[PDB]
Amino acid sequence: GRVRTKTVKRASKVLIERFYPKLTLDFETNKRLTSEIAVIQSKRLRNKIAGYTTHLMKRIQKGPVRGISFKLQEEERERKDQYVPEVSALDLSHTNGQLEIDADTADLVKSLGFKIPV
Amino acid sequence: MENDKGQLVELYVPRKCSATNRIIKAKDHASVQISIAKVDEDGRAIAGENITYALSGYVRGRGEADDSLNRLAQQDGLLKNVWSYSR
Amino acid sequence: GWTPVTKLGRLVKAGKITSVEQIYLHSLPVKEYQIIDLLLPDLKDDVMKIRSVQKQTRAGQRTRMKAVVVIGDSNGHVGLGIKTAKEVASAIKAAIVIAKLSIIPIRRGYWGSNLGQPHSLPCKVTGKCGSVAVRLIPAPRGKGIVASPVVKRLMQLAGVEDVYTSSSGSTRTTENTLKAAFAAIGNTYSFLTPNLWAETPLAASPLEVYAEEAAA
Amino acid sequence: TRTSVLADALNAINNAEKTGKRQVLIRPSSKVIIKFLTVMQKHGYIGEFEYIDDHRSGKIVVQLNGRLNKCGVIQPRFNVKINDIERWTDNLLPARQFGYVILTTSAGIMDHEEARRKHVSGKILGFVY
Amino acid sequence: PKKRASNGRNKKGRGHVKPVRCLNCARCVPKDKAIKRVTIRNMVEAAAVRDLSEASVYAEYALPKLYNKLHYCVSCAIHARIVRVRSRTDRKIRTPPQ
Amino acid sequence: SLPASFDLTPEDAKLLLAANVHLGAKNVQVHNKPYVYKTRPDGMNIINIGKTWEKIVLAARIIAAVPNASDVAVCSSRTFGQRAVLKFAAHTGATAIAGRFTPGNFTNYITRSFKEPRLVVVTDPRTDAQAIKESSYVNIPVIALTDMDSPSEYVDVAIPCNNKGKHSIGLIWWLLAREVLRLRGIIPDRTTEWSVMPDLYFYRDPEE
Amino acid sequence: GKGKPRGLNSARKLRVHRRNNRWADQAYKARLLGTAFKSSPFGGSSHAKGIVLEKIGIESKQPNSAIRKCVRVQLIKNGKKVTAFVPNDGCLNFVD
Amino acid sequence: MRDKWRKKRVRRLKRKRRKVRARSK
RNA sequence: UACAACAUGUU
RNA sequence: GAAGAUGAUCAGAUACCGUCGUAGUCUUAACCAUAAACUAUGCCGACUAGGGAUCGGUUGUUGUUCUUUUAUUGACGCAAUCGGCACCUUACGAGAAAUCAAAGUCUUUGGGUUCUGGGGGGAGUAUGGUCGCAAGGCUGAAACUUAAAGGAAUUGACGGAAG
Ligand SMILES: CN[C@@H]1[C@@H](O)[C@@H](O[C@@H]2[C@@H](O)[C@H](O[C@H]3O[C@H]([C@@H](C)O)[C@@H](O)[C@H](O)[C@H]3N)[C@@H](N)C[C@H]2N)OC[C@]1(C)O
Ligand SMILES: CN[C@@H]1[C@@H](O)[C@@H](O[C@@H]2[C@@H](O)[C@H](O[C@H]3O[C@H]([C@@H](C)O)[C@@H](O)[C@H](O)[C@H]3N)[C@@H](N)C[C@H]2N)OC[C@]1(C)O
Ligand SMILES: [Zn+2]
């Protein structure tokens, strides 16, 4: 079969990490770009790297893939990681007016010297 | 370790476990040394001032370090009504 | 051209930590032999046994050489290292490294009166490894080291002058014998005597009071 | 059945000591156990120990301070001359400067150094160090 | 050495157990040790289910179920793949497969 | 000692009780006896809350007593504490370990991932066994968030809290961070609130 | 424990038990049975004299191959017949 | 030799040795 | 279904 | 179904496999006293770490099923204990290791007590005694011979072993 070795795969990973905006979804344009980027000493190795990179790009379009870390994904994964809801979930507004706790915790908190409404 | 004319010849006096009074050895790499910041009355810590608790590997491996530190801390004033002597 | 890769090594090279007892007191793991040979410059090694071990393969045996080394400053510090390598010289060098990284302090003591410096052990201690058990017993002044040659060399490089020995088991297994003796001689700093009852306050490790020169 | 209550007491003390326990319950108690415990306490190896009356034989709770390596009985209680104490201290004791061989003598239960001071001897009872 | 803590059987608490005869070779084997299987199978093979349904007089008539319990000696159980030799850390699994 | 200013303020009881922290595991250990308040018809045990609170305070003082803040290590293998530990590291300057703990990060000194923390703070003692096991080799104290069925071997300080629940884990980490900030001096006082809203620290689903 | 009595009045049991089990040691058993006096060819002596009856060659056992020169000897004190090795190169020609 | 049959061989041998003995009291 | 055995001694 | 007779397989099979089939298998009254009669782990006593089940007894208790829908019903469910047959995790501690909650509390060597072993063979043989109808059981040497025999684990190789 045609299973891609580790050299081509790691080469493609570093191309995607370090030049993501330049790379495209076209094998020929990817060829001419990988000629400029890396210094492979063989036409065949250059072609295998570029084509497997094109396949990787065509996969990346349908969501992030685990293993690649170009400096474009972190921006979304970070500004989406600051998601601060305007309405909180730990406030007692969502649960109408009473801590929906069973009687056991009711007696527990009454033992802690609180006057809590439940 | 003394001699006739009172000069100490001990190479070094080793630390002992605060919970079990056992000597902590030089290769006892499972032993720890807790350091807890002491707090001023504002509610802030204090620059370079602590009380430190030494535990040996034996108590830590026996799963007894938590109760031992509970006792030591609450008896030094760093805790209240957590550790109970009656069970 | 050595450059430290650990906080303790960084502190040792900077001169913040000047003694091994500064390390033993807090049980700091030592991974760089440069720490030892800076802190403990004058050290004597001694190859104790060279043995060939073999692995059977489909083409033939695979002979490797196992070396046993004892290191010691004759002043209360001693270490034991074992390493197996394809050549005798490389095995001995790596065993010297391993021996330096395992050096421990030894508690010397008096058998009877306390004229002068400690000459023997403080108490009876024993160590075991495999079938071998080695028992070290305090001896009066003027006794030599009553021991087999391997244990005697270990006691001399530890710095002990008076000691009785009594082994049991297959003492011809030299690695087990030396490991049992090493475990025995290190237990002098674990047997609690009344003179160590007096509580001393828990001090602060140098890696605490120098926690910026240790970061890098 | 039970053949030496002192042996059970000292074994329980040693086993509780090795596990890091601060306290050990001894049952049953006896005069010999109390005298032996008093000898061990006077040297600091144990703390306060308290006797519970159950109208049957008594129980003892001992406060262990963690300073004790080994307590045990020498059974049978061998007869010891005045100058055969040397071999017993050489064989049972860690060193010539700490630890005690407890003897029962006609002058009472004591350790071997007190026996030398009083020049008395009797039967060996146990040891502590 | 000792291979198994149960000695390859189930007899902690008693002296002796009556034997049973192996299904294949009629070997006497202790009941607690015999490998035993409870099999429920359909009395008619599946490829003839609809043919017998067509040929039957009755309508909505159930199919009788075959019940038997099978006992094997260890040799006749291993030679039939009913159990298979397992590894040292996998011998210590009594939970059935899935 | 310590003033009568911490005292488990009732708003903290709000946050704990809403986040279902006190919901202990159905089966409890002998080492977790002085943490259960009682049992309930379902079966699960209720964890005392004042104990949890002042254990959080004790832990926070342990963190605050440390020199350069990167020497505090927070970690979680479980897919509920990654966000919490990363937020804690951001707001305290400590070092976080999310996802995988590579066996050898604490003892193997030639890795380019070598770390020498002075304290290991962990989400779950069981699911994060590797970090604790390796800390035992190199003398690192461990502060742990322990449930009622979590193992206690090789832990110095245990915070009794439900470590199965998303909101519970996030809230516990958030309170640790806030205590540490108040002690360090970033937050002026207990009365002063925090720019960080509680639903932060809470791991979000990767599907919206 | 230990399977031996420890009672302070148990000296008879201890001494008799040691005496019984010393029979399991070969040297003790030989010196108390007097086997050297009764069954040894030399009767317990270090040396003995005898008359050569015949020269015999004995095949060396594996993994060696050789002929070890020996003589069959009848002892004087008791008339017993023993085989003795004649040790050195060509020393068999000295004995007849 | 399967010591079981080694014992069986001795039993038969010892049985016959007891026949030869009884032949002459 | 059937399948028995492999001269001595080493480096 | 030992033995025996007989058909096959086979180089040969007085073996495995097939067909018979005498003792025996069963019982009564007497003998015999041995098994890998094994947990290959003496008995009595004390202590040392966690967990969930199960059998017997007792003690407190329900949103359940049954008498009746109701009791002094029965079953079942939930917590405590005493005794058991065991099991699971860890390695305190043990061990040559396999492994062991005892095979732990044993060079820091001592709770009480019985029995057994002292390199491998010869040999559980010979002999004397003794018990048995007998088969045999119990007690039980020596000469002589010999450098290993053996235990647990590792790597490899091999298997008419599995994947
Ligand atoms: C023929 N060899 C014998 C051997 O049989 C054995 O002999 C014992 C002997 O020692 C026993 O006798 C022994 O044990 C008893 C004890 C039971 O009371 C002691 O009283 C007696 O002094 C002591 N000799 C004796 N009762 C039986 C022989 N088989 O041990 C001694 C021996 C010489 O090796
Ligand atoms: C007729 N039954 C015989 C029975 O007599 C006996 O046979 C022995 C046999 O074992 C002896 O065999 C003995 O002698 C040979 C020989 C090389 O020296 C050696 O293998 C060894 O010493 C020993 N097996 C043999 N020498 C005499 C037969 N009567 O043992 C075998 C047997 C089948 O039970
Ligand atoms: Zn079968």
PDB file of N, CA, C and O in Angstrom, chain C residues 59-105:
ATOM      1  N   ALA C  59      21.210 -16.305  18.392  1.00  0.00           N
ATOM      2  CA  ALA C  59      22.520 -16.420  17.770  1.00  0.00           C
ATOM      3  C   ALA C  59      23.629 -16.772  18.751  1.00  0.00           C
ATOM      4  O   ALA C  59      24.646 -17.334  18.330  1.00  0.00           O
ATOM      5  N   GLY C  60      23.464 -16.461  20.023  1.00  0.00           N
ATOM      6  CA  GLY C  60      24.482 -16.734  21.015  1.00  0.00           C
ATOM      7  C   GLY C  60      24.223 -15.921  22.263  1.00  0.00           C
ATOM      8  O   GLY C  60      23.256 -15.169  22.352  1.00  0.00           O
ATOM      9  N   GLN C  61      25.117 -16.085  23.233  1.00  0.00           N
ATOM     10  CA  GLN C  61      25.011 -15.306  24.456  1.00  0.00           C
ATOM     11  C   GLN C  61      25.300 -13.834  24.186  1.00  0.00           C
ATOM     12  O   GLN C  61      25.993 -13.479  23.231  1.00  0.00           O
ATOM     13  N   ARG C  62      24.753 -12.974  25.040  1.00  0.00           N
ATOM     14  CA  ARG C  62      25.026 -11.539  25.015  1.00  0.00           C
ATOM     15  C   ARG C  62      25.734 -11.201  26.323  1.00  0.00           C
ATOM     16  O   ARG C  62      25.082 -11.003  27.352  1.00  0.00           O
ATOM     17  N   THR C  63      27.062 -11.131  26.289  1.00  0.00           N
ATOM     18  CA  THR C  63      27.840 -10.911  27.502  1.00  0.00           C
ATOM     19  C   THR C  63      27.930  -9.421  27.814  1.00  0.00           C
ATOM     20  O   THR C  63      28.386  -8.630  26.984  1.00  0.00           O
ATOM     21  N   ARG C  64      27.498  -9.045  29.012  1.00  0.00           N
ATOM     22  CA  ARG C  64      27.687  -7.711  29.551  1.00  0.00           C
ATOM     23  C   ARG C  64      28.480  -7.820  30.843  1.00  0.00           C
ATOM     24  O   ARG C  64      28.503  -8.868  31.490  1.00  0.00           O
ATOM     25  N   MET C  65      29.142  -6.732  31.214  1.00  0.00           N
ATOM     26  CA  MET C  65      30.030  -6.725  32.366  1.00  0.00           C
ATOM     27  C   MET C  65      29.422  -5.878  33.474  1.00  0.00           C
ATOM     28  O   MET C  65      29.078  -4.714  33.253  1.00  0.00           O
ATOM     29  N   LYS C  66      29.287  -6.464  34.661  1.00  0.00           N
ATOM     30  CA  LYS C  66      28.736  -5.775  35.817  1.00  0.00           C
ATOM     31  C   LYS C  66      29.856  -5.465  36.797  1.00  0.00           C
ATOM     32  O   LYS C  66      30.612  -6.359  37.185  1.00  0.00           O
ATOM     33  N   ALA C  67      29.957  -4.202  37.193  1.00  0.00           N
ATOM     34  CA  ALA C  67      30.992  -3.745  38.105  1.00  0.00           C
ATOM     35  C   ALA C  67      30.366  -3.229  39.392  1.00  0.00           C
ATOM     36  O   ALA C  67      29.247  -2.710  39.393  1.00  0.00           O
ATOM     37  N   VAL C  68      31.101  -3.379  40.492  1.00  0.00           N
ATOM     38  CA  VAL C  68      30.674  -2.919  41.807  1.00  0.00           C
ATOM     39  C   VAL C  68      31.744  -1.989  42.355  1.00  0.00           C
ATOM     40  O   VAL C  68      32.921  -2.360  42.418  1.00  0.00           O
ATOM     41  N   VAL C  69      31.336  -0.789  42.761  1.00  0.00           N
ATOM     42  CA  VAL C  69      32.259   0.251  43.199  1.00  0.00           C
ATOM     43  C   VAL C  69      31.799   0.797  44.542  1.00  0.00           C
ATOM     44  O   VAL C  69      30.599   1.001  44.763  1.00  0.00           O
ATOM     45  N   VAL C  70      32.751   1.037  45.441  1.00  0.00           N
ATOM     46  CA  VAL C  70      32.491   1.707  46.709  1.00  0.00           C
ATOM     47  C   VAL C  70      33.276   3.015  46.736  1.00  0.00           C
ATOM     48  O   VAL C  70      34.470   3.039  46.421  1.00  0.00           O
ATOM     49  N   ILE C  71      32.594   4.099  47.092  1.00  0.00           N
ATOM     50  CA  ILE C  71      33.187   5.427  47.179  1.00  0.00           C
ATOM     51  C   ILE C  71      33.113   5.882  48.631  1.00  0.00           C
ATOM     52  O   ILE C  71      32.189   5.519  49.366  1.00  0.00           O
ATOM     53  N   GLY C  72      34.101   6.659  49.057  1.00  0.00           N
ATOM     54  CA  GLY C  72      34.097   7.133  50.426  1.00  0.00           C
ATOM     55  C   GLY C  72      35.201   8.106  50.777  1.00  0.00           C
ATOM     56  O   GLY C  72      36.312   8.020  50.247  1.00  0.00           O
ATOM     57  N   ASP C  73      34.904   9.034  51.684  1.00  0.00           N
ATOM     58  CA  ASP C  73      35.848  10.059  52.104  1.00  0.00           C
ATOM     59  C   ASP C  73      36.559   9.731  53.408  1.00  0.00           C
ATOM     60  O   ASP C  73      37.295  10.579  53.919  1.00  0.00           O
ATOM     61  N   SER C  74      36.338   8.541  53.967  1.00  0.00           N
ATOM     62  CA  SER C  74      36.949   8.097  55.220  1.00  0.00           C
ATOM     63  C   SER C  74      36.625   9.022  56.388  1.00  0.00           C
ATOM     64  O   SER C  74      37.335   9.022  57.398  1.00  0.00           O
ATOM     65  N   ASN C  75      35.566   9.818  56.274  1.00  0.00           N
ATOM     66  CA  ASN C  75      35.220  10.788  57.303  1.00  0.00           C
ATOM     67  C   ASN C  75      33.711  10.880  57.476  1.00  0.00           C
ATOM     68  O   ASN C  75      33.159  11.964  57.683  1.00  0.00           O
ATOM     69  N   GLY C  76      33.022   9.752  57.398  1.00  0.00           N
ATOM     70  CA  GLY C  76      31.594   9.717  57.626  1.00  0.00           C
ATOM     71  C   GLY C  76      30.721   9.744  56.395  1.00  0.00           C
ATOM     72  O   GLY C  76      29.507   9.925  56.528  1.00  0.00           O
ATOM     73  N   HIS C  77      31.291   9.585  55.206  1.00  0.00           N
ATOM     74  CA  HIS C  77      30.533   9.580  53.965  1.00  0.00           C
ATOM     75  C   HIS C  77      30.974   8.391  53.132  1.00  0.00           C
ATOM     76  O   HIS C  77      32.170   8.110  53.024  1.00  0.00           O
ATOM     77  N   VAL C  78      30.005   7.692  52.546  1.00  0.00           N
ATOM     78  CA  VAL C  78      30.289   6.468  51.815  1.00  0.00           C
ATOM     79  C   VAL C  78      29.151   6.236  50.839  1.00  0.00           C
ATOM     80  O   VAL C  78      27.996   6.553  51.127  1.00  0.00           O
ATOM     81  N   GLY C  79      29.481   5.686  49.672  1.00  0.00           N
ATOM     82  CA  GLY C  79      28.479   5.394  48.672  1.00  0.00           C
ATOM     83  C   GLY C  79      28.792   4.101  47.949  1.00  0.00           C
ATOM     84  O   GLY C  79      29.939   3.659  47.880  1.00  0.00           O
ATOM     85  N   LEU C  80      27.739   3.501  47.402  1.00  0.00           N
ATOM     86  CA  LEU C  80      27.828   2.229  46.701  1.00  0.00           C
ATOM     87  C   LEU C  80      27.121   2.339  45.360  1.00  0.00           C
ATOM     88  O   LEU C  80      25.967   2.773  45.300  1.00  0.00           O
ATOM     89  N   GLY C  81      27.802   1.927  44.293  1.00  0.00           N
ATOM     90  CA  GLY C  81      27.218   1.962  42.968  1.00  0.00           C
ATOM     91  C   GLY C  81      27.443   0.708  42.149  1.00  0.00           C
ATOM     92  O   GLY C  81      28.535   0.139  42.153  1.00  0.00           O
ATOM     93  N   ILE C  82      26.407   0.272  41.439  1.00  0.00           N
ATOM     94  CA  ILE C  82      26.444  -0.924  40.607  1.00  0.00           C
ATOM     95  C   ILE C  82      25.927  -0.560  39.224  1.00  0.00           C
ATOM     96  O   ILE C  82      24.875   0.075  39.102  1.00  0.00           O
ATOM     97  N   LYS C  83      26.655  -0.962  38.184  1.00  0.00           N
ATOM     98  CA  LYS C  83      26.227  -0.657  36.829  1.00  0.00           C
ATOM     99  C   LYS C  83      26.771  -1.714  35.878  1.00  0.00           C
ATOM    100  O   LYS C  83      27.877  -2.223  36.064  1.00  0.00           O
ATOM    101  N   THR C  84      25.985  -2.036  34.856  1.00  0.00           N
ATOM    102  CA  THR C  84      26.343  -3.043  33.867  1.00  0.00           C
ATOM    103  C   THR C  84      26.465  -2.395  32.496  1.00  0.00           C
ATOM    104  O   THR C  84      25.528  -1.740  32.028  1.00  0.00           O
ATOM    105  N   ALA C  85      27.615  -2.587  31.855  1.00  0.00           N
ATOM    106  CA  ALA C  85      27.883  -2.025  30.542  1.00  0.00           C
ATOM    107  C   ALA C  85      28.729  -3.004  29.743  1.00  0.00           C
ATOM    108  O   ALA C  85      29.368  -3.900  30.297  1.00  0.00           O
ATOM    109  N   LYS C  86      28.735  -2.809  28.423  1.00  0.00           N
ATOM    110  CA  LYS C  86      29.348  -3.784  27.527  1.00  0.00           C
ATOM    111  C   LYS C  86      30.855  -3.882  27.727  1.00  0.00           C
ATOM    112  O   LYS C  86      31.440  -4.940  27.479  1.00  0.00           O
ATOM    113  N   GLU C  87      31.496  -2.809  28.179  1.00  0.00           N
ATOM    114  CA  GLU C  87      32.928  -2.795  28.438  1.00  0.00           C
ATOM    115  C   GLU C  87      33.186  -2.576  29.922  1.00  0.00           C
ATOM    116  O   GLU C  87      32.404  -1.923  30.614  1.00  0.00           O
ATOM    117  N   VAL C  88      34.301  -3.129  30.402  1.00  0.00           N
ATOM    118  CA  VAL C  88      34.645  -3.028  31.819  1.00  0.00           C
ATOM    119  C   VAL C  88      34.904  -1.579  32.212  1.00  0.00           C
ATOM    120  O   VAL C  88      34.460  -1.124  33.272  1.00  0.00           O
ATOM    121  N   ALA C  89      35.631  -0.836  31.375  1.00  0.00           N
ATOM    122  CA  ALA C  89      35.984   0.539  31.713  1.00  0.00           C
ATOM    123  C   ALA C  89      34.750   1.428  31.804  1.00  0.00           C
ATOM    124  O   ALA C  89      34.598   2.207  32.755  1.00  0.00           O
ATOM    125  N   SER C  90      33.857   1.326  30.822  1.00  0.00           N
ATOM    126  CA  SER C  90      32.632   2.115  30.855  1.00  0.00           C
ATOM    127  C   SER C  90      31.766   1.730  32.045  1.00  0.00           C
ATOM    128  O   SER C  90      31.158   2.595  32.687  1.00  0.00           O
ATOM    129  N   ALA C  91      31.699   0.433  32.352  1.00  0.00           N
ATOM    130  CA  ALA C  91      30.917  -0.020  33.493  1.00  0.00           C
ATOM    131  C   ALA C  91      31.465   0.544  34.795  1.00  0.00           C
ATOM    132  O   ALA C  91      30.701   0.990  35.653  1.00  0.00           O
ATOM    133  N   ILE C  92      32.790   0.554  34.950  1.00  0.00           N
ATOM    134  CA  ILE C  92      33.389   1.099  36.165  1.00  0.00           C
ATOM    135  C   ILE C  92      33.153   2.602  36.266  1.00  0.00           C
ATOM    136  O   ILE C  92      32.869   3.122  37.349  1.00  0.00           O
ATOM    137  N   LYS C  93      33.267   3.328  35.153  1.00  0.00           N
ATOM    138  CA  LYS C  93      33.020   4.769  35.197  1.00  0.00           C
ATOM    139  C   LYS C  93      31.574   5.069  35.584  1.00  0.00           C
ATOM    140  O   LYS C  93      31.308   5.913  36.454  1.00  0.00           O
ATOM    141  N   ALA C  94      30.624   4.366  34.967  1.00  0.00           N
ATOM    142  CA  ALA C  94      29.221   4.590  35.294  1.00  0.00           C
ATOM    143  C   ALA C  94      28.903   4.161  36.719  1.00  0.00           C
ATOM    144  O   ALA C  94      28.068   4.785  37.382  1.00  0.00           O
ATOM    145  N   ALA C  95      29.567   3.117  37.214  1.00  0.00           N
ATOM    146  CA  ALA C  95      29.377   2.714  38.598  1.00  0.00           C
ATOM    147  C   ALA C  95      29.950   3.741  39.565  1.00  0.00           C
ATOM    148  O   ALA C  95      29.391   3.940  40.642  1.00  0.00           O
ATOM    149  N   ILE C  96      31.056   4.397  39.209  1.00  0.00           N
ATOM    150  CA  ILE C  96      31.563   5.487  40.040  1.00  0.00           C
ATOM    151  C   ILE C  96      30.550   6.623  40.097  1.00  0.00           C
ATOM    152  O   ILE C  96      30.323   7.224  41.156  1.00  0.00           O
ATOM    153  N   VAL C  97      29.938   6.946  38.956  1.00  0.00           N
ATOM    154  CA  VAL C  97      28.892   7.969  38.958  1.00  0.00           C
ATOM    155  C   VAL C  97      27.755   7.568  39.896  1.00  0.00           C
ATOM    156  O   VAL C  97      27.337   8.343  40.767  1.00  0.00           O
ATOM    157  N   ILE C  98      27.255   6.338  39.742  1.00  0.00           N
ATOM    158  CA  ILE C  98      26.136   5.874  40.557  1.00  0.00           C
ATOM    159  C   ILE C  98      26.512   5.874  42.035  1.00  0.00           C
ATOM    160  O   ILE C  98      25.693   6.204  42.900  1.00  0.00           O
ATOM    161  N   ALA C  99      27.752   5.501  42.348  1.00  0.00           N
ATOM    162  CA  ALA C  99      28.203   5.494  43.734  1.00  0.00           C
ATOM    163  C   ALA C  99      28.246   6.901  44.310  1.00  0.00           C
ATOM    164  O   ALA C  99      27.868   7.110  45.467  1.00  0.00           O
ATOM    165  N   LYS C 100      28.718   7.873  43.527  1.00  0.00           N
ATOM    166  CA  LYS C 100      28.729   9.252  44.004  1.00  0.00           C
ATOM    167  C   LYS C 100      27.318   9.759  44.258  1.00  0.00           C
ATOM    168  O   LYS C 100      27.077  10.472  45.237  1.00  0.00           O
ATOM    169  N   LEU C 101      26.370   9.401  43.391  1.00  0.00           N
ATOM    170  CA  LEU C 101      25.013   9.899  43.589  1.00  0.00           C
ATOM    171  C   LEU C 101      24.305   9.275  44.785  1.00  0.00           C
ATOM    172  O   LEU C 101      23.252   9.778  45.187  1.00  0.00           O
ATOM    173  N   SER C 102      24.845   8.204  45.362  1.00  0.00           N
ATOM    174  CA  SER C 102      24.186   7.505  46.456  1.00  0.00           C
ATOM    175  C   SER C 102      24.870   7.721  47.797  1.00  0.00           C
ATOM    176  O   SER C 102      24.514   7.050  48.770  1.00  0.00           O
ATOM    177  N   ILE C 103      25.835   8.640  47.879  1.00  0.00           N
ATOM    178  CA  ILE C 103      26.582   8.819  49.118  1.00  0.00           C
ATOM    179  C   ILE C 103      25.658   9.301  50.223  1.00  0.00           C
ATOM    180  O   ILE C 103      24.781  10.148  50.009  1.00  0.00           O
ATOM    181  N   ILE C 104      25.842   8.736  51.412  1.00  0.00           N
ATOM    182  CA  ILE C 104      24.996   9.000  52.574  1.00  0.00           C
ATOM    183  C   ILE C 104      25.897   9.293  53.764  1.00  0.00           C
ATOM    184  O   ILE C 104      27.073   8.902  53.785  1.00  0.00           O
ATOM    185  N   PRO C 105      25.383  10.000  54.763  1.00  0.00           N
ATOM    186  CA  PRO C 105      26.162  10.232  55.977  1.00  0.00           C
ATOM    187  C   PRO C 105      26.054   9.065  56.946  1.00  0.00           C
ATOM    188  O   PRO C 105      25.020   8.403  57.056  1.00  0.00           O
TER     189      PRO C 105
END
